[PDB]
Amino acid sequence: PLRDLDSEHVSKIVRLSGIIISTSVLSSRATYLSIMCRNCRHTTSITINNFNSITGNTVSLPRSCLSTNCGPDPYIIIHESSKFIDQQFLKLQEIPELVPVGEMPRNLTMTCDRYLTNKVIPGTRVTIVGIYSIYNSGGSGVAIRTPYIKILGIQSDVETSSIWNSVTMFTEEEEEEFLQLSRNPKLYEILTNSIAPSIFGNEDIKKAIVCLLMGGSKKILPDGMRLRGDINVLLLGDPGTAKSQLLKFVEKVSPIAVYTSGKGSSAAGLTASVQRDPMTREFYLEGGAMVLADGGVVCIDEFDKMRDEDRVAIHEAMEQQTISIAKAGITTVLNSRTSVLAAANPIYGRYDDLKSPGDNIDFQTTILSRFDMIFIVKDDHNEERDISIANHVINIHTGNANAMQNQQEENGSEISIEKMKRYITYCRLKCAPRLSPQAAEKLSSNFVTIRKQLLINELESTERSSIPITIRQLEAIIRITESLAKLELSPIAQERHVDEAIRLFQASTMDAASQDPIGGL
Amino acid sequence: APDAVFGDRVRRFQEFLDTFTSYRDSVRSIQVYNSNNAANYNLNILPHRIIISLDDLREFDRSFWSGILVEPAYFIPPAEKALTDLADSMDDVPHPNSRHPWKLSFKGSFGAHALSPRTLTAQHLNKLVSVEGIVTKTSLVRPKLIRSVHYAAKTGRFHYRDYTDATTTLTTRIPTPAIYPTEDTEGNKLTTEYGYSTFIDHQRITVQEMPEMAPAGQLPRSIDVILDDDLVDKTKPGDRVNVVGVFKSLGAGGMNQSLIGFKTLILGNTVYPLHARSTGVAARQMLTDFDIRNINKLSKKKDIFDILSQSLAPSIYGHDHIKKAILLMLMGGVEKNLENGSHLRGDINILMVGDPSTAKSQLLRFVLNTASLAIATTGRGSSGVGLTAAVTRRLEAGAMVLADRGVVCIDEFDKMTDVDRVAIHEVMEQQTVTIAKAGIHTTLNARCSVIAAANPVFGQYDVNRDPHQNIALPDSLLSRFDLLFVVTDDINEIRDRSISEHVLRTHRYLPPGYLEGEPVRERLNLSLAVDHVFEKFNPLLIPKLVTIPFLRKYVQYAKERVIPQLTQEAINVIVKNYTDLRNDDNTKKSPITARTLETLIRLATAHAKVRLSKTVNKVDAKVAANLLRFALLGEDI
Amino acid sequence: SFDRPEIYSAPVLQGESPNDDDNTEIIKSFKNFILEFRLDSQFIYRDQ
Amino acid sequence: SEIHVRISDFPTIYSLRELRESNLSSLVRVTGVVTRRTGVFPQLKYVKFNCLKCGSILGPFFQDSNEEIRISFCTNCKSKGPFRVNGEKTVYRNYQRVTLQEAPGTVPPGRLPRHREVILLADLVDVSKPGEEVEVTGIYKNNYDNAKNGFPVFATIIEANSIKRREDVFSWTEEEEREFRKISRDRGIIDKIISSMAPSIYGHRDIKTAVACSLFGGVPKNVNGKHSIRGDINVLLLGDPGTAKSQILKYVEKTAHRAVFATGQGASAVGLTASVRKDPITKEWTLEGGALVLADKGVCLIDEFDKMNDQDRTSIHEAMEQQSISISKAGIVTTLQARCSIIAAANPNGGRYNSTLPLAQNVSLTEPILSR
Ligand SMILES: Nc1ncnc2c1ncn2[C@@H]1O[C@H](COP(=O)(O)OP(=O)(O)OP(O)(O)=S)[C@@H](O)[C@H]1O
Ligand SMILES: Nc1ncnc2c1ncn2[C@@H]1O[C@H](COP(=O)(O)OP(=O)(O)OP(O)(O)=S)[C@@H](O)[C@H]1O
Ligand SMILES: Nc1ncnc2c1ncn2[C@@H]1O[C@H](COP(=O)(O)OP(=O)(O)O)[C@@H](O)[C@H]1O
Ligand SMILES: [Mg+2]
Ligand SMILES: [Mg+2]
Ligand SMILES: [Mg+2]
Ligand SMILES: [Zn+2]
Ligand SMILES: [Zn+2]
């Protein structure tokens, strides 16, 4: 442990765990430098193959001409014939969980060189093998020295992923395993049943999760008009209906995913947060769930409780998948190609069947337009369901029945989260299906039918429906169809994919519109 | 002392220059340009610099190419000497009143040397690297004394001394710290002769990894670039930049016994400002004679306006007059600067209030992508500090100051604070930002055209209500918007099926070089701020649609080479329409003020610019008033 | 990039009493000896 | 190498305000609370100096706490030129500085508590945490290094010989483990533990039952790495003023292992929120985990849970929903673990509980936090 390093470990190999809190800029260290005397032309070379890890410089230029008067330090470095290597200063710290309550957490300076540089980022939990060494620079003291670590190896653990920390490279057998898994005729069921098998009675929501994880195919029109392929799903529901647990599972199973709240995490943001640099005072992207999870999904719980600074940002980053930062000096369109899975509670704790979905919710009504599919997770107080749910939840709690039956069901009917995550990555990186012309015509006919019935329902009434069917809803059904086609690696979305997407859209945002007094018959 | 290898490389690069005649043509053109305005004035003097294509060098001599890329300190000085020798060889006609060292700049494919400040490591040192990044700091352009000339009055003689530093040469010299001569060799006091001494401009910029490619949540990496005597002031802070230069190491890095490591920086050879969307760099485009011929050919057509209107956003169905207004704003009017100092605005602002999903944001994103210079902002995502200027004892330009002579696309305009609203009030009509803060009284130029999107009060535009209650925006603010379009999502079966067939046809699109089920790749389009007219893919199935790059070329040509003059035959129509609009009672969407006379004038001028006409005729005024009457009422006359 | 600042002086006042041992008093007395010494009504050292 | 002698039971016990120049270079025995500790640093003990003329490593030279030593004589080449300590072959001893401040109770009225610097050498390091009342026996000496004061004034230090707490705790032996296993078998043990909690708090028997349940807690469960359930019992204490709620929190801090006490407003010993903060004196950044991170496997005791900042509310809410603290600040993007059991104490919304109104509208905090 970092707090257990005494003076007996000095100049010895020590293994110590911790978290990286700083990674300095790479600095150039001379590993072979040509030198020439000033009041001469005596060419010499100084080779530094060892002792590259030290705060000071143990080997300096000669203080004499070495040709044996020229003077003190007569050598200059011929920089165009010298060779340099990279060095980095890391700052390890004991993990803040195991720290005395009233004392400063203890940190330690580390130096790495050559191929051990740019291996870890700040916040990474690491295992450092190194030499516990000493340099002279912890204030008032006599004969005291500053300890540090010459890194001989870094062992990073499983940490936060990113669009930069993506393999995109499948081993040959892994492609073959995924491809065999793809022809499986019951692939829709095996992937649906693998969405939180512990949550019970949410098959349509699980299909929506599958479609969101797949997502539709992106289009880049010749105009530059980008059409979005990612799917956004909202879950409005009674408390205790598993909405958060299905968000946590989506975070776990997605390749890249960030789970946050409406107001963000404890210190993490939610959208692109441009901040001044800690030392250089230069604008940089501090973070944000929507930019950190670029290329994946963000699971926003308590979506209703969110600030207006994040409101417009997420509204922009769901249709255009881009956050347009424009501050005093910095203006940039940051890519935010992220699917959004949101969970929200009704303004009153329970969902009011009497009132429409709008005015039963805290946020703006038109926000319901931005989401592709909206699931009203009402709670049914029927006892058959109550007994079944209680039995299931007890099976979860030390019954150990669900774990065993899931392991049994994994043999041909369920997929592990690692394998399913890698399959999601492969499907997103390999398939982007289109629509057959007949499928497109029937989609158009279906959309016209829905919109005409909405017009009929709204003509006789006075106010407008809380959940409106707009052109965005048509473009969403298209996305669901393409996600269903991409599920089985189908290059073309046929009639069955369209029918399944239609059924999903009737299950959510149409049953959700059924409770609307104006959106209903 | 002469070096045999140096001469061999000099003659090899001379052979290279002889093989590719474009370099004698460029040097000859530069020399004749310099001589011609030297004799003319007994404008500006072009620098003695030549852009060298590394691909041509690789074709000619691959080792010379690899030597320049890998060992620039040994191959660039010989090539520059060869270029200087060639230039002094062609200099049969010297400029009025070897010599005149010519510098080299490089372009082409760098391969593994095309890097970023993050990937630029210590094993790229002493290599010719191209680094792409964002300029965060630009130091003062300071003169550097490279030759001091002194006068001795006792002898009446002029002396001089040349100065050299470590950054002026790619190779390392012996350092010679020659002192500043305060006296002659024999004791005579010297007087410095400023104006005969030689000072060379020197700048030190900092290039940081671009936000669009830097990792999220990680501290960015920066690199220093040094520019000398012609690359200074080539960029401004916030600019996307591509700097080609030698990654040099300087000093001793603490080895010389008197630093933690060696001091490294880039000796800039070439600076390319890059065009990225929502940045402060405009989009220069190369207009060949074929492009200008096609532009004039299409301008001769009567319905060219419509051809340009439909080709803007074919993917969006409808919104035809909105597209006409967007094209007119892209052209814009001509600003008037009267002799007394007053300013008349020539920029067209557009507001689009509408129901959810009527493509207001897609029409904003298209304008952001296709405009020469466009900055994208969102309401309350950028404040007045973020929109207008900000005091940091120094000023940092905001959204509407960087977008000077450009377009500002404001999404969610209704969700904007009043503190921002007042600054926007100033920016829209007077086209200026007055700071007057913390002892900094400055009037920045914000001559930008604003296109904005907004939602109604209740989220759905109620046709029963009146616009003034549905907008909930200050009337003085709505006056500044030249064209206010209220778009409503009316459920009608004909347009319902037509918009759905369009949406599906657009979704059923394949690029020319892609398979049926291949995910379309996407780059960030870092265009360089310096082949068919019509488009193959037509979502509508009809007039012809021109490609977006050709439309940008046409807009650039009309915007930079056409300045229409108003005519009496247009003035009669403009005045009649303005008088009718002011006096006729029609329950207009927006109020009618003297600003309405000027949006008539501006739209007429913009439509005249569309036709490449230098005079605003009667048809231009009629169509401008037509669009305005549509925008105010909804007429189709 | 400026020149060398100059330093110069000028007599304005009587300073402290000329002291006999001062190098400048000794130089003055030698100069007076050279200019004023007479041998047989001849300024021998001046003429020499 | 050597045995260190720890003199104990010194008769003359001084106070830090009673130390004068007559006690210099002598052995004193002071008492006080530790207020700060400055890490652990190596200090030269057996110095071997490398000659830069030969490359010779001169033999071990004993260095002590007085001043650094230097060598000017070589043997192989007898050079007197630059001689560098060889860090690799030098031997080091542990060194620590502890600020010892007079216990506030013992200070006479009107006088401010006095502090000294105690130097712990090679065996006493990391034995006295801040806030611990200890008796330091040591040597009272002058730290030699005058013009700021206008007088030749010297600072003083206490080089500690033996340090001990004047008055591990949760550890058990085999006999104690057998005693635990036997006393558990007795019937009615649950009620005995419930009555054991808070033995100066009258009644409140349901509160004590909940406190015992939270102190022992449940067990966390993962189905297959796919469904997670917390194994911590969060207990809220909604009470009127003078209901002893704070005392049931201080008792939990008494009895719980890995217990962190925080407040919605007041003494900010811990901030409830993880932040990357740059320390203004030591120049270096620190990633402070929140009060919910510090008690990763224990209990977090919040007083004034009715009144909290939006930042603290968000931190507590998301650490109760996910059992983790996500932070993306100053280039650090990480998810710390906060698998804590939360015991909160709140005052009703208004001053007194209203039985006619439901609990949701009787207190400031709302549905999402109350559910957890
Ligand atoms: N159908 C279900 N099957 C299994 N567990 C369930 C089910 N419904 C609820 N639970 C459990 O109920 C507990 C709390 O549910 P949550 O996921 O927090 O509900 P929620 O509806 O998201 O609550 P809010 O709205 O976020 S306060 C979790 O531990 C779930 O495992
Ligand atoms: N049941 C009780 N047994 C013993 N002392 C009690 C009891 N109830 C209240 N007190 C005393 O009443 C005082 C209340 O102090 P606290 O325990 O801090 O109360 P509190 O509920 O935290 O008050 P607020 O709400 O913070 S003003 C203390 O002196 C307690 O010792
Ligand atoms: N009239 C239309 N023609 C074509 N596409 C449309 C139309 N109206 C909406 N859309 C589609 O709706 C989607 C969302 O539109 P968007 O611009 O985000 O709406 P809003 O202006 O309300 O923010 C886009 O994919 C866009 O192509
Ligand atoms: Mg929840
Ligand atoms: Mg919009
Ligand atoms: Mg209290
Ligand atoms: Zn020499
Ligand atoms: Zn020696």
UniProtKB/Swiss-Prot annotation, chain A:
Report the portion of the entire protein shown.
Answer: 147 to 700 of 775
- Which protein are we looking at? Minichromosome maintenance protein 5
The MCM domain covers which part of the protein?
A: 187-394
Its UniProt miscellaneous note says: Present with 10300 molecules/cell in log phase SD medium.
- Location within or outside the cell: Nucleus
Give the record's subunit note: Component of the MCM2-7 complex. The complex forms a toroidal hexameric ring with the proposed subunit order MCM2-MCM6-MCM4-MCM7-MCM3-MCM5; loaded onto DNA, forms a head-head double hexamer. Interacts with CSM1.
Q: What is the similarity comment for this entry?
A: Belongs to the MCM family.
Primary localization: nucleus
Q: Which GO terms describe its molecular function?
A: ATP binding; ATP hydrolysis activity; chromatin binding; DNA replication origin binding; helicase activity
State which Enzyme Commission number(s) the record gives: 3.6.4.12
Motif Arginine finger, residue range(s) on this chain? 369-372
Gene name, please? MCM5
Q: Which reaction does it catalyse?
A: ATP + H2O = ADP + phosphate + H(+)
Role summary: Acts as a component of the MCM2-7 complex (MCM complex) which is the putative replicative helicase essential for 'once per cell cycle' DNA replication initiation and elongation in eukaryotic cells. The active ATPase sites in the MCM2-7 ring are formed through the interaction surfaces of two neighboring subunits such that a critical structure of a conserved arginine finger motif is provided in trans relative to the ATP-binding site of the Walker A box of the adjacent subunit.
The terms describing its cellular component in GO are: chromosome, telomeric region; CMG complex; cytoplasm; DNA replication preinitiation complex; MCM complex; nuclear pre-replicative complex; nuclear replication fork; nucleoplasm
Q: Where does ATP bind?
A: 237-244
UniProtKB/Swiss-Prot annotation, chain B:
Reactions the enzyme catalyzes: ATP + H2O = ADP + phosphate + H(+)
Q: Keywords on this record? A: ATP-binding, DNA replication, DNA-binding, Helicase, Hydrolase, Nucleotide-binding, Nucleus, Phosphoprotein
Where it sits in the cell: the answer is: Nucleus
MCM domain span: 304-504
Q: Which positions are annotated as binding ATP?
A: 354-361
Look up the EC number in the record and give it. Answer: 3.6.4.12
One GO CC annotation? DNA replication preinitiation complex
Q: Which terms in the Gene Ontology molecular function aspect does this entry carry?
A: ATP binding; ATP hydrolysis activity; chromatin binding; DNA replication origin binding; helicase activity; MCM complex binding; single-stranded DNA binding
Signal peptide span per the entry? none
Q: Where is this motif: Arginine finger?
A: 479-482
Q: What class of enzyme is it?
A: hydrolase
The main location class comes to nucleus
Q: Give the similarity note.
A: Belongs to the MCM family.
Oligomeric and partner information: Component of the MCM2-7 complex. The complex forms a toroidal hexameric ring with the proposed subunit order MCM2-MCM6-MCM4-MCM7-MCM3-MCM5; loaded onto DNA, forms a head-head double hexamer. Interacts with CSM1.
Question: What function does the entry list?
Answer: Acts as a component of the MCM2-7 complex (MCM complex) which is the putative replicative helicase essential for 'once per cell cycle' DNA replication initiation and elongation in eukaryotic cells. The active ATPase sites in the MCM2-7 ring are formed through the interaction surfaces of two neighboring subunits such that a critical structure of a conserved arginine finger motif is provided in trans relative to the ATP-binding site of the Walker A box of the adjacent subunit. The six ATPase active sites, however, are likely to contribute differentially to the complex helicase activity.
List the range of the whole protein covered here.
16 to 742 of 971
Swiss-Prot record, chain C:
Q: What top-level branch of life does the organism fall under? A: Eukaryota
Which intervals of the chain are annotated as region Disordered? 1-21
Span-the-membrane segments of this chain are none
| Subcellular location field | Nucleus
Give the miscellaneous note. Answer: Present with 10300 molecules/cell in log phase SD medium. Early fractionation of eukaryotic MCM proteins yielded a variety of dimeric, trimeric and tetrameric complexes with unclear biological significance. The MCM2-7 hexamer is the proposed physiological active complex.
User: How does the annotation summarize its subunit structure?
Assistant: Component of the MCM2-7 complex. The complex forms a toroidal hexameric ring with the proposed subunit order MCM2-MCM6-MCM4-MCM7-MCM3-MCM5; loaded onto DNA, forms a head-head double hexamer. Interacts with CSM1.
What job does this protein perform? Acts as a component of the MCM2-7 complex (MCM complex) which is the putative replicative helicase essential for 'once per cell cycle' DNA replication initiation and elongation in eukaryotic cells. The active ATPase sites in the MCM2-7 ring are formed through the interaction surfaces of two neighboring subunits such that a critical structure of a conserved arginine finger motif is provided in trans relative to the ATP-binding site of the Walker A box of the adjacent subunit.
The record's family statement is: Belongs to the MCM family.
Q: What protein name applies here?
A: Minichromosome maintenance protein 5
Species assigned in the record:
Saccharomyces cerevisiae (strain ATCC 204508 / S288c) (Baker's yeast)
Gene name per UniProt: MCM5
Swiss-Prot record, chain D:
Portion of the parent chain present: 291 to 676 of 868
What's the effect of swapping residue 102 to K?
Answer: In allele MCM2-1
Q: Where does the chain cross the membrane?
A: none
**Function statement:** Acts as a component of the MCM2-7 complex (MCM complex) which is the putative replicative helicase essential for 'once per cell cycle' DNA replication initiation and elongation in eukaryotic cells. The active ATPase sites in the MCM2-7 ring are formed through the interaction surfaces of two neighboring subunits such that a critical structure of a conserved arginine finger motif is provided in trans relative to the ATP-binding site of the Walker A box of the adjacent subunit.
Q: What is the effect of changing residue 372 to A?
A: Loss of MCM2-7 complex helicase activity
Task: Report the residue ranges that make up the MCM domain in this protein.
Answer: 189-372
Q: Where does ATP bind?
A: 239-246
Effect of mutating residue 74 to Y/F/S/H: Loss of activity
Q: To which protein family does this belong?
A: Belongs to the MCM family.
Provide the assembly information. Component of the MCM2-7 complex. The complex forms a toroidal hexameric ring with the proposed subunit order MCM2-MCM6-MCM4-MCM7-MCM3-MCM5; loaded onto DNA, forms a head-head double hexamer.
Q: What is this protein called?
A: DNA replication licensing factor MCM2
- Reproduce the miscellaneous comment text: Present with 1690 molecules/cell in log phase SD medium.
Q: Which gene encodes it?
A: MCM2
From which source organism is this entry?
Saccharomyces cerevisiae (strain ATCC 204508 / S288c) (Baker's yeast)
Q: Where in the cell is it found?
A: Nucleus
Per UniProt, the C4-type Zn-finger stretches lie at 51-77
